[PDB]
Amino acid sequence: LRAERWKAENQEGMAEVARFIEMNGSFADENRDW
Amino acid sequence: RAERWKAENQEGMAEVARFIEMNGSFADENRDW
Amino acid sequence: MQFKVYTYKRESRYRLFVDVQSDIIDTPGRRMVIPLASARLLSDKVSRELYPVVHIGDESWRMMTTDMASVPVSVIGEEVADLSHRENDIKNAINLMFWGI
Amino acid sequence: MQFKVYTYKRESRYRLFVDVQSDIIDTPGRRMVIPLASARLLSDKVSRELYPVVHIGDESWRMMTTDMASVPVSVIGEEVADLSHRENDIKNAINLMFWGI
């Protein structure tokens, strides 16, 4: 499936974003009213 | 028609706004930035 | 996991939500979800197109699409239901909030 | 306003966000927005499909589509840009997040 190829394709970048969010901060966190 | 939906929905949109302002926003709540 | 309904482990007016994020989109420790509220809490003036009504056991819930958020795994409880069959209506509620829809 | 970039009037890692909510969906007091991060902060191992690089003047920014969130009108400052010319990329990024490829 094209979708599974994509996931594996962008797994490396998803990690870098995860690390980045932790470091910097999460926008959703500062902002969910429930 | 996009205008009509907005006019049609004006009553309904405020009520969620109100319900959310009274109950509470799932947003200001779980957002981390 | 997409279209699954979980318990909200936090003290708030919301008790349930539904995961609406793609299963192909891996955000470690986070999922984008839509919160549910009892259907009688909102009048019929509220768009069923924007805020769909779903059923989970002995209760009807409105899906607060506009009040969606990403939540930490930490407040994500156990699966209580699966609304994958309502994929069309969920997809329509969301595409409409962002686009004309 | 949809596709406008505004400032974030709050102590935060993010200083800018883009309004990505339909202009016909009026949620009194709140708008759904995607935060911006200095493009320099991320490598290009990170999907541009999911995280579009947009420019404000000569400076490049990454749209943290996944870190999106609705905000109060009260934390929304001055409009600093208009990105209506990236509606395609922006729309594809958002859809990638909910409905995969």
Swiss-Prot record, chain A:
Ranges for region Interaction with CcdB? 3-34
Q: Which GO terms describe its molecular function?
A: DNA binding; toxin sequestering activity
Query: Keyword Transcription regulation: yes or no?
Result: yes
Instruction: Quote the disruption phenotype from the UniProt entry.
Output: Leads to cell death and induction of the SOS pathway. Additional disruption of ccdB reverses this effect, i.e. no cell death nor induction of the SOS response. The double disruption leads to increased plasmid loss.
PTM field: Degraded by the Lon protease.
The terms describing its cellular component in GO are: toxin-antitoxin complex; transcription repressor complex
GO biological process: any one?
A: negative regulation of DNA-templated transcription
Q: Write out the entry's keywords from A to Z.
A: DNA-binding, Plasmid, Repressor, Toxin-antitoxin system, Transcription, Transcription regulation
Q: Does the keyword Lyase apply?
A: no
Family, as annotated: Belongs to the CcdA antitoxin family.
Biological role: Antitoxin component of a type II toxin-antitoxin (TA) system which inhibits the post-segregational killing (PSK) of plasmid-free cells, also referred to as a plasmid addiction system. Labile antitoxin with a half-life of about 1 hour in the presence of CcdB. Binds to and blocks the activity of CcdB; will also remove bound CcdB protein from the CcdB-GyrA complex by forming a CcdA-CcdB complex, a process termed rejuvenation. The N-terminal 36 residues are not required for rejuventation. Functions as a transcriptional corepressor for the ccdAB operon, repression also requires CcdB.
Oligomer and partners: Homodimer in solution and when bound to DNA. Forms a complex with toxin CcdB; there are both high- and low-affinity binding sites for CcdA such that both CcdA-CcdB(2) and CcdA(2)CcdB(2) complexes can form. The CcdA-CcdB(2) trimer is sufficient for rejuvenation, whereas maximal operon repression occurs with CcdA(2)CcdB(2). When the CcdA:CcdB ratio is lower than 1, a CcdA(2)-CcdB(4) complex is formed which is devoid of repression activity. In this case repression is alleviated and both proteins are produced.
The name of this protein is: Antitoxin CcdA
Curated annotation (Swiss-Prot), chains C, D:
Q: Does the keyword Repressor apply?
A: yes
Alphabetical UniProt keywords: Plasmid, Repressor, Toxin-antitoxin system, Transcription, Transcription regulation
Q: What happens when the gene is disrupted?
A: Disruption of both ccdA and ccdB has no phenotype, except for increased plasmid loss.
Q: Does the keyword Repressor apply?
A: yes
Q: Which GO terms describe its biological process?
A: negative regulation of DNA-templated DNA replication; negative regulation of DNA-templated transcription; plasmid maintenance
Instruction: Return one GO MF term.
Output: DNA topoisomerase type II (double strand cut, ATP-hydrolyzing) inhibitor activity
- How changing G100 to E/R affects the protein? Loss of toxicity, no decrease in protein stability. Still represses ccdAB operon, still forms complex with CcdA
Supply the InterPro entries for this chain.
CcdB, Plasmid_toxin/cell-grow_inhib
The terms describing its cellular component in GO are: toxin-antitoxin complex; transcription repressor complex
Report the protein's function.
Answer: Toxic component of a type II toxin-antitoxin (TA) system, functioning in plasmid maintainence. Responsible for the post-segregational killing (PSK) of plasmid-free cells, also referred to as a plasmid addiction system. Half-life of over 2 hours. Cell killing by CcdB is accompanied by filamentation, defects in chromosome and plasmid segregation, defects in cell division, formation of anucleate cells, decreased DNA synthesis and plasmid loss.
What family does the entry list? Answer: Belongs to the CcdB toxin family.
Q: How does it assemble?
A: Homodimer. Forms a complex with GyrA, probably a tetramer GyrA(2)CcdB(2), in which GyrA is inactive. Forms a complex with antitoxin CcdA; there are both high- and low-affinity binding sites for CcdA such that both CcdA-CcdB(2) and CcdA(2)CcdB(2) complexes can form. The CcdA-CcdB(2) trimer is sufficient for rejuvenation, whereas maximal operon repression occurs with CcdA(2)CcdB(2). When the CcdA:CcdB ratio is lower than 1, a CcdA(2)-CcdB(4) complex is formed which is devoid of repression activity. In this case repression is alleviated and both proteins are produced.
The name this protein carries in UniProt is: Toxin CcdB
